[PDB]
Write a protein that binds this ligand. Structure first.
Ligand code: ZN
Ligand code: ZN
Lengths: 56, 11
């Protein structure tokens, strides 16, 4: 596998949402909008979901 | 969206 073996939030290795763009691992409830189940399609972690790079 | 299941802190 190519992402963390536990939720970056909990350090718990439950069902971890494999960020489609990066090796970040989270529980669907350790996100901003908690999910009742793993999303359909391209899911990105909070780290990847920032469109505006705050260079300043 | 993908998911892994490894070592969650149940034990
Ligand atoms: Zn978690
Ligand atoms: Zn990511």
């Amino acid at each position: 596998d190519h992402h963390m073996e536990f939720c970056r939030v909990c350090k718990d290795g439950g069902e971890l949402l494999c960020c489609d763009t990066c090796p970040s691992s989270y529980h669907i409830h350790c996100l901003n909008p908690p999910l009742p189940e793993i999303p359909n399609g391209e899911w990105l972690c909070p780290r990847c979901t920032c469109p505006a790079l705050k260079g300043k | 969206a993908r998911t892994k299941q490894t070592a969650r802190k149940s034990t």
